[PDB]
Amino acid sequence: PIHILAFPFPAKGHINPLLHLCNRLASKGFKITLITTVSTLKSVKTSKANGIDIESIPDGIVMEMNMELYFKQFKASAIENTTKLIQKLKTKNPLPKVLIYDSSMPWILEVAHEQGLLGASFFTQPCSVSAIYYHMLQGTIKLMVSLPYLPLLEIKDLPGVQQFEDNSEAVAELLADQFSNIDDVDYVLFNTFDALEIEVVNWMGSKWPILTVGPTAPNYLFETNTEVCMKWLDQREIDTVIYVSFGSLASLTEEQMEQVSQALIRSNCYFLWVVREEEENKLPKDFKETTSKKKGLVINWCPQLDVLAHKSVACFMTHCGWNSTLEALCSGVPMICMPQWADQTTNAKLIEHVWKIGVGVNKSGIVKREEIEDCIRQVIESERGKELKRNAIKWKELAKEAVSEGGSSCNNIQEFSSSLL
Ligand SMILES: C[C@]12CC[C@H](O)C[C@@]1(O)CC[C@H]1[C@@H]2CC[C@]2(C)[C@@H](C3=CC(=O)OC3)CC[C@]12O
Ligand SMILES: O=c1ccn([C@@H]2O[C@H](COP(=O)(O)OP(=O)(O)O)[C@@H](O)[C@H]2O)c(=O)[nH]1
Numbered sequence: 001p002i003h004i005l006a007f008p009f010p011a012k013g014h015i016n017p018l019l020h021l022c023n024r025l026a027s028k029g030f031k032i033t034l035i036t037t038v039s040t041l042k043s044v045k046t047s048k049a050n051g052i053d054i055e056s057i058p059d060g061i062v063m064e065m066n067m068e069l070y071f072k073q074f075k076a077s078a079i080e081n082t083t084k085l086i087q088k089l090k091t092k093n094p095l096p097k098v099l100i101y102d103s104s105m106p107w108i109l110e111v112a113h114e115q116g117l118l119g120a121s122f123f124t125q126p127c128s129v130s131a132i133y134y135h136m137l138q139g140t141i142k143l144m145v146s147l148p149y150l151p152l153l154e155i156k157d158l159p160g161v162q163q164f165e166d167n168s169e170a171v172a173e174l175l176a177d178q179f180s181n182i183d184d185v186d187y188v189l190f191n192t193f194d195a196l197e198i199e200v201v202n203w204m205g206s207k208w209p210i211l212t213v214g215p216t217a218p219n220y221l222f223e224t225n226t227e228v229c230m231k232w233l234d235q236r237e238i239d240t241v242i243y244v245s246f247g248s249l250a251s252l253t254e255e256q257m258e259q260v261s262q263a264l265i266r267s268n269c270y271f272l273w274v275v276r277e278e279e280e281n282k283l284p285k286d287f288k289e290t291t292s293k294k295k296g297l298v299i300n301w302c303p304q305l306d307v308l309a310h311k312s313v314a315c316f317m318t319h320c321g322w323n324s325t326l327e328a329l330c331s332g333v334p335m336i337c338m339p340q341w342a343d344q345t346t347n348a349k350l351i352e353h354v355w356k357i358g359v360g361v362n363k364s365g366i367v368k369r370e371e372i373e374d375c376i377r378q379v380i381e382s383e384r385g386k387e388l389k390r391n392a393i394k395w396k397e398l399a400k401e402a403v404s405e406g407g408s409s410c411n412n413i414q415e416f417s418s419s420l421l
Pocket of ligand 1: 009104164175249250
């Protein structure tokens, strides 16, 4: 077999779409080794089914306390320790042939090439948002805005780096650095499909031979509480459930959590709300145990792909991370957009104004219950919500074609697989 190594940035929004690509490639007969940090592996609860090997490297460092310092420490430790790991893997058959690494770690290309491997950069954000990082690197823009093949943007629609305060400068450099060595990359992979963003993919394809391979999602390494979640959803009728999740990193204040809580209660809809276990203690005092009980399931993590695929889910209140955006679109699920920072602001603009499968909430800097309640009504009940559902069903059909035989993403994964020879 041809042996592929995969190195995500250590966060679930980066591990998961690479994991899904790895599962596809394992299906085609490739051997996969996934490289994770010690800290990621502590959270890994199921892996036997994948048949992929998992190797761990030290964390190398928490990162938000000083982004400029700890990202550089993580980079140096990752260079050193993936070099050591590759050296050990070169004592075993089949020898590794290619390293697919997260696009935010472009210096890993140098480790791939120094070890005799091909290097594939795996972008976990769409071409439209990645275009912004390239223009930042060219100096065309810095942290109304007109960029080629993107809709007119307000300042609020640009990737939100200002929210990171002191880390703002370091975060901006990191995002731009994703393109610093793109001419030397052996394979440029994007987790998107052409029909989603035809013009910016075409523009990008005139500069480098990019491979759009998305959605990579078709399944989980972490605890998803699958049985409880799917049994609860199986008790719900079609189009009755609001799925609420702010992803794996974003943290809402107690003041914001209460507005969300009251909005979901006052809405009188059924809701499944992922509140991560370290965020639980900010919910109103009796919410999880009694108040949420008549209409809601409050759970620390869920099988988001299966939840979004469930016919009972009427819409998705989301922070607009790209995986959650792409998953809802491929599932035909319209959204309520509550972006927090980074690319989420840009994603929310694309959801609402380009793909037209969601609405956005207006802050007052706290989003109020009645605003969230208005958005629920717009989606669940209003005629606007029916058009958003019809647009989402159209995108699902195009994503379906993309990953099926003859589709753009299936062909690109086939071209990549065949290039490995
Ligand atoms: C800064 C912050 C904020 C949430 C936490 O509380 C504290 C964090 O340091 C955790 C790290 C995270 C996040 C912010 C997003 C990042 C830039 C993210 C991305 C890399 C990329 O290519 O695409 C986005 C991973 C690294 C990141 O800086
Ligand atoms: O209860 C949950 C919530 C999220 N996810 C997954 O976690 C990832 C979140 O990625 P995203 O890009 O949306 O935002 P981030 O967590 O990076 O901020 C996605 O794979 C979701 O499907 C999940 O499996 N269960």
